[PDB]
Amino acid sequence: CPLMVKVLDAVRGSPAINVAVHVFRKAADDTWEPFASGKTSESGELHGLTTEEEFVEGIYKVEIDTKSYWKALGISPFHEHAEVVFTANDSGPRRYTIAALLSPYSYSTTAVVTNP
Amino acid sequence: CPLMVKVLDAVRGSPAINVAVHVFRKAADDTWEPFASGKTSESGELHGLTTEEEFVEGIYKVEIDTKSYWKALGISPFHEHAEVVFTANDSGPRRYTIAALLSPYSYSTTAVVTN
Amino acid sequence: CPLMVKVLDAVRGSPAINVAVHVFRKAADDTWEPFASGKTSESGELHGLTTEEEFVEGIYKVEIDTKSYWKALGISPFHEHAEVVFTANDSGPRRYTIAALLSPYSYSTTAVVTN
Amino acid sequence: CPLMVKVLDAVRGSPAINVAVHVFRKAADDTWEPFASGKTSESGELHGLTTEEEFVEGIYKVEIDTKSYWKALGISPFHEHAEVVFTANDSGPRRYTIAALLSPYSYSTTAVVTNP
Ligand SMILES: COc1cc(O)c2c(=O)cc(-c3ccc(O)c(O)c3)oc2c1
Numbered sequence: 001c002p003l004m005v006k007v008l009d010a011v012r013g014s015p016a017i018n019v020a021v022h023v024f025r026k027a028a029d030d031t032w033e034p035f036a037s038g039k040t041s042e043s044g045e046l047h048g049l050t051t052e053e054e055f056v057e058g059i060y061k062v063e064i065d066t067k068s069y070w071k072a073l074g075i076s077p078f079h080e081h082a083e084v085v086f087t088a089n090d091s092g093p094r095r096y097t098i099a100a101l102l103s104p105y106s107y108s109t110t111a112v113v114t115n116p
Numbered sequence: 117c118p119l120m121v122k123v124l125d126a127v128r129g130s131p132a133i134n135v136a137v138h139v140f141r142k143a144a145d146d147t148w149e150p151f152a153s154g155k156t157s158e159s160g161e162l163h164g165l166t167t168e169e170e171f172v173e174g175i176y177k178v179e180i181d182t183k184s185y186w187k188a189l190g191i192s193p194f195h196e197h198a199e200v201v202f203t204a205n206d207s208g209p210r211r212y213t214i215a216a217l218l219s220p221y222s223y224s225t226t227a228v229v230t231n
Numbered sequence: 232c233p234l235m236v237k238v239l240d241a242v243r244g245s246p247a248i249n250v251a252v253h254v255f256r257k258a259a260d261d262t263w264e265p266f267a268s269g270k271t272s273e274s275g276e277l278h279g280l281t282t283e284e285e286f287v288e289g290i291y292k293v294e295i296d297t298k299s300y301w302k303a304l305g306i307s308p309f310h311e312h313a314e315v316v317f318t319a320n321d322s323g324p325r326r327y328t329i330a331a332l333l334s335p336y337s338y339s340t341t342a343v344v345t346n
Numbered sequence: 347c348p349l350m351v352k353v354l355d356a357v358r359g360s361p362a363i364n365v366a367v368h369v370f371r372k373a374a375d376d377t378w379e380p381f382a383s384g385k386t387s388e389s390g391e392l393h394g395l396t397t398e399e400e401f402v403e404g405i406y407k408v409e410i411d412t413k414s415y416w417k418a419l420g421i422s423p424f425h426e427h428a429e430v431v432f433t434a435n436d437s438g439p440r441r442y443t444i445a446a447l448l449s450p451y452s453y454s455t456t457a458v459v460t461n462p
């Protein structure tokens with residue numbers, strides 16, 4: 001898979017398990033079209049969102065459902081979600097790992113991009 | 117003003133100057149309505165976006181134009197922009213500072229909410 | 232003052248108040264010599280640590296007592312402290328702000344160096 | 347191995363390769379004794395620093411040689427190194443991953459702690 005999402009919990013020092021993730025792709029009319037979705041596993045990772053064939057050039061938005069995550073742990077957090085927006089595959093196919101590190105009032109996100 | 121945005125550059129160890137910032141309010145039909153905008157100052161800060169009277173409870177989005185910032189420095193970045201989406205809540209402290217720390221392939225954002 | 236320390240709490244979205252901070256200078260024999268210290272204020276800031284005359288070039292270490300901060304809030308943390316080690320350089324801009332953003336199992340630190 | 351170090355480069359969007367790491371353990375006299383060292387691989391990971399038997403309770407310091415890393419890439423960075431200091435194994439053996447995300451004037455570090 002050319003798109004993977006990894007989420008960590010900075011309060012617990014653990015993977016962030018059962019985090020919902022929705023991916024969108026900007027359409028020709030400039031709307032955000034639903035592209036793929038899933039949830040993180042016990043390891044904090046979400047694999048299998050898409051395929052090399054389907055993951056064409058485009059502008060993609062990875063929404064990480066942080067508020068839904070934190071509230072289930074009894075924490076009222078600040079953000080609604082984390083949104084990671086990027087152009088993909090503009091120089092040919094790449095593999096993308098989107099990582100996020102979550103706290104109730106803060107998050108950081110990183111991308112690791114590799115050429116297969 | 118109840119909303120301030122502060123932007124820092126983790127590559128040069130400096131405020132991120134002249135960065136465009138757009139704030140939107142979520143409307144009843146779920147679209148994003150322009151609310152306020154500006155450019156960060158020489159200190160990386162953008163003050164005066166709104167007033168107590170206008171900044172009612174609701175969902176807001178702060179978009180920070182990170183891509184143009186990095187391109188003006190000759191650096192190829194990953195993200196189109198950084199987006200910070202949150203609910204304004206009258207029960208909490210009254211002053212919101214949205215801080216962002218920028219790198220070409222990463223950013224971190226924080227909310228400092230005080231009285 | 233050429234050196235300021237700012238500490239933020241990523242769990243509560245607030246300044247980190249009453250955090251002990253110790254600054255050390257590296258001596259010729261490689262040991263760490265106490266240099267300045269204090270506690271962060273209600274704004275999470277510690278001003279007045281040193282002066283231009285005393286803050287000569289060299290290697291400095293800023294230790295932030297994060298463990299005591301989290302324990303006073305009833306939260307079990309990972310780190311003993313956060314340590315920031317850097318060289319002061321007269322060629323660069325003259326004012327150093329060392330910022331730290333704290334979580335129980337993580338921290339991030341940044342240097343904002345300006346004139 | 348119960349101690350692993352992972353390092354990422356926030357400028358390049360890549361693993362941070364060939365980063366030197368020195369681990370110390372506080373001795374009874376309160377000095378920092380050299381405990382293990384190594385360097386990150388092509389994946390940004392450093393495995394095999396220690397063993398379950400040798401990684402006893404203690405206060406450990408993981409020094410990540412960030413300045414040496416960045417200068418080789420033609421970047422004069424701010425910090426000398428990142429130092430991650432923590433008590434380990436105080437409630438019995440655990441597995442620790444120390445992760446760091448590096449920029450020239452900033453870094454963030456996280457721990458993921460698991461119970462085997
Ligand atoms: C199990 O421990 C791991 C494993 C990873 O793959 C990762 C990873 O891929 C990325 C990061 C990370 C660390 C600090 C940040 O501020 C950030 O945005 C990301 O942590 C990990 C920790």
Ligand SMILES: COc1cc(O)c2c(=O)cc(-c3ccc(O)c(O)c3)oc2c1
Pocket residue numbers: 106122124213215216217224225226228237239328330331332339340341343
């Ligand atoms: C001038 O120095 C300052 C001043 C500030 O108010 C701030 C501030 O409000 C927040 C942060 C900050 C630091 C690290 C992060 O990972 C992050 O997301 C934010 O840095 C500052 C630095």
Ligand code: NA
Pocket residue numbers: 089090091092
């Ligand atoms: Na192209």
Ligand code: NA
Pocket residue numbers: 435436437438
């Ligand atoms: Na014990």
